[PDB]
Assembly symmetry: D2
Homo-oligomer: 341 residues x 4
């Protein structure tokens, strides 16, 4: 194993996305060859560690041109896990490119995740405002919803990816603009799942004034409220009683979290909606994709829109019908009562 600085590699090369006739998905076409592959994994998890080693071994064996990128602390963790050099000659060790977060962000052509939903969410968030490279997600360890591929098929799947034969689902994201009373500027954060406000530690209910496109919608006194992407419709929003929304639908979900109301039916809003929520009368917690942000005081506001740089997240898909299969087999959608045995 040899650790090298990632700053030796060229900046990210963009892929092209085309919508073929009678497809729900976008063809992933590498206009310049794929080279910079960043691999992230669920930490402190044996199966993701072993799968990473095995995936990198496979890449170094089968794809000389591919440069493997990992985090610094990860490169240290897995260096001892490789023993046999390439084709068993001591002159080709396993080259791991690594460096500061920004260097990785600037150079990544393809993001590969080994783990669950958290792994994808945190990998994608690392990119901040840089357009996100395509995401190839393998499910390892405890199951989540978003990763379509079993690690066992990693060789066949990656071959389709690098050969411009794979297709991607486009997942839209929300932008959260936080405006606190005190200071000058907005803090902007991107959400794959959701942005939510919650009483959290406080025993007192939130009082939220909700505006759509400048028009007052409603006051809600509640545990909180969730604004979700269609991707996020299966996450917190689903727990709170929301509908399941195919990731192909352009929309924003507004789902109340335990409201003092008999009639706050969940809303499905247009993609282009501008949502403003004002904290009315440390009272309220703000979270983006589950990660706590600043605490909000009475008078603070969030402004939420769809992300409009190529926007959104392109995730390699297994089939044209991944969503159907996921809701059935992962979420237990419309499970039949037992009719025999």
């Amino acid at each position: 194993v040899k650790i090298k600085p990632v700053n030796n590699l060229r900046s990210s090369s963009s892929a092209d996305f085309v919508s073929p006739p009678n497809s729900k998905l976008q063809s992933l076409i590498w206009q310049n060859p794929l080279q910079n592959v960043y691999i992230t994994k669920k930490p402190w998890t044996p199966s993701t560690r072993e799968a990473m080693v095995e995936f990198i071994t496979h890449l170094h064996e089968s794809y000389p041109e591919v440069n493997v990128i990992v985090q610094p602390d990860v490169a240290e963790e897995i260096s001892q896990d490789f023993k046999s050099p390439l084709e068993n000659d001591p002159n080709r060790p396993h080259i791991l490119y690594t460096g500061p977060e920004q260097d990785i962000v600037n150079r990544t052509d393809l993001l590969v995740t080994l783990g669950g939903d958290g792994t994808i969410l945190h990998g994608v968030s690392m990119f901040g405002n840089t357009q996100v490279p395509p995401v190839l997600a393998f499910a390892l360890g405890t199951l989540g919803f978003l990763s379509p591929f079993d690690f066992k098929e990693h060789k066949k799947v990656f071959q389709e990816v690098i050969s411009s034969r794979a297709k991607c689902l486009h997942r839209t994201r929300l932008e959260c603009h936080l405006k606190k009373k005190d200071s000058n500027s907005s803090i902007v954060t991107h959400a794959m799942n959701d942005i939510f406000l919650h009483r959290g530690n406080s025993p007192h209910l939130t009082n939220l004034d909700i505006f759509i496109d400048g028009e007052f919608l409603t006051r809600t006194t509640a545990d909180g409220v969730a604004l979700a992407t269609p991707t996020g419709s299966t996450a917190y929003s689903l727990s709170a009683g929301g509908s399941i929304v195919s990731p192909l639908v352009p929309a924003i979900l507004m789902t109340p979290i335990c409201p003092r109301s008999l009639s706050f039916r969940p809303l499905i809003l247009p993609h282009s909606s501008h949502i403003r929520i004002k904290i009315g009368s440390s009272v309220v917690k703000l979270s983006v994709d589950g990660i706590p942000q600043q605490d909000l005081d009475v008078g603070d506001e969030i402004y939420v829109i769809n992300e409009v740089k190529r926007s959104g997240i392109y995730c390699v898909a297994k089939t044209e019908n991944d969503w159907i299969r996921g809701i059935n087999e992962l979420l237990g959608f419309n499970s039949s009562f037992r009719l025999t045995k």
Copy 2:
């Protein structure tokens, strides 16, 4: 057809010129008449005095104020209301009120504007006439018991019609669904068009429907239930709402799939892409009740047919369906009152998120 007054003449609607499709310049679309507005088709909720009175009053206004305007009504309505006009135009007995009428196909071809006098059902049946063709703009006045869709009080009719004819009105676009019924032992299809919804229901039968649902050629689920509803966003506030569905803005491109009293704890309502291809086949359980008339099919509330085990419906949006391997202006334009009709409608008419009593 016999008029019940010498002050009314009933004339063939084929005496009128073909429809002038308007322009829609653009979240609301401006309604701008390329050819001037002339042929106004008026429908009303039947057997309700207020709407018959409103129709006569509206037609009187058009005949008084807009000489270029031609009034079209249904044949039975023409006969019904003919005795209600108690004077000719401008006190001149040689200028009777003229009402144009004829068969649907004749009316459909010549309508520039649909005006409805009644409730939600009035709009639904009116638009339903224009199923296989282009729907003219829809001007909807609420009379009698309130519904959700008609944005105007009939009291406002002079000022609203004024704005419409002068090309100063704006419209909300509402999408339409297509239901294709394919009977067991048939390769033909019966096509219907939906503004609200398409639904299957056990109806008169005491036994639950058993329905196999396929999306984009893939099997989704079997449901055993009262039935299932497929709804436009417009229809999200209708049957689908009653069945526990989400409220969907009419600007969202989606199809709702909402179960009706399912034997399941986990049939959460689904929101599907507007591009979806939906097939529902009427099934049964092994050795059973009757296999005929086990399910009723309705489209915008209108019973179509009882269906048998083996029948299928195919449901798609009017435009933009994606057919994955293994499977004329569109939509409806409704004259809007404000740029915020939707939020105000859900709040004031449906009581969306009504606060618990906080004072007094």
Copy 3:
């Protein structure tokens, strides 16, 4: 096989029910020996037919004192199914007692069901206003919710029953009093599950005025409304969004069926409630335990109370915790999302 008239048998002997300390159930104590056993089965169903033969064979073999009662058309159907007489001597054929419905009702000590929920419901309804004998329910064919026993354990279970060692769950029933505008008197019907009003064949919504103990509750415009026992809480009421209510709770459920309202949350009402529902402005169908009754016109009324003759239905229970097990294993209660494989 020999067919005999059931009118040769004594009238029904009642069992005694005692609530032992630290039990949820009622001990079934035969004060006079159990003798008259009426067996009913889901019709046109091979497995129930074969199980009936096998159960009767077992009774004639092991319990000389037991008299087997079946329906006339059933006695004809199964007579050919027996071939071997008792202990293979031609002088003891299989004695089947049968006769008119009322004779069976008057003489039954124990009702045995072989089938599903429908079998129990229709067997129990046969008794009209006569107090219902204890019910021993075996699940055969397609699964339903109410029968706690697998037919395979029929010998062990019946031995506990006849030996006064079994325990019963007491299920309460509702009484429906139908008062049509036209005529003089009420038609009274008993419900194990529910009484419901529904638009049925009509495309027009029902308009129902609901009164509790003489006080106006609400007008509902809807597909309909269901009034359910706790037993019925897992039936139609559950499909309509009702809560799952243990059969030990004294209560009446009022669950709207697709109401034109955002705020008709299902209600749980006191056991002693008097519920009156008036049909407001062939418009409305009435069903009791799923069986269509008379059609109702505007101005007709139903009056619904708990049945107050020993009241209710005593069903032989398998364990103290049948309800937990049924909701988990039959209804898929709180099914976990897939966490592995």
Copy 4:
């Protein structure tokens, strides 16, 4: 304790006689005083002018009209309101307003009647004082922002108190739950009493709670969620309602089990027998986040403790629990306004089954 006026004397509540438990002759129970009503404990919503004003006005009325009556308030309240009395009794400077006060245990032993001035929280905290003992009858006046439980406007206080003291009032019985907290590595229990509910919640933690639920010693389910609520019928209109629970009449003997934002499509709310034995153990998933402070426990909204993996709560009704093998007047009596407070409350305060707008 220092009074802020020579017109008020603050006296030890132990100067008063032990409580007189009333009689409850019998769906409402008549409140008939065996010993005459004397010791009136008054609580108010803190830091709200209307309730401080109401307290002074109520106490003034008692002192003017009922010489036999003794007023008990909290120690800090006695000091707070002492400066608010601007005259002595009957203009006699030798007859100051007397306010009795002391520690909870002292107050609890001597209260004939609890009077609350505020909202739902005021009742909850007031009743909470009488946890391990008998709860005196509760007379609840609504001041400030409306809640659900207080049936009387404070304006009505003279006429209502008149009915109560003269043994002409009626009360609704509300049952209480007991929460037994058994810490990990402990065999002792911390007991609390609930009028509304007992709930577990992730609170400050960003991770979901993992809770193992046992009923009557049998494992029911593991839930991964924000949390779970166990509620009385009284509490069915509180947190449980917000979480999607059914509205349960306070005359039904039951315990509600309602999930709070569960990771499941099938955790339908449960209604359990009042006799039920409920145990909930704080679990975790294999190799995880922190194991401490993973869940908050609240009882009637009051945070008790952060709980750790391995802690358990046991929840039972105050009376009538059945313990299947392997596992003083009770309840709360609230003075009622009419024989139909419940139907009127759900309709008028909660907007139960609010009709869509049908006219105007």
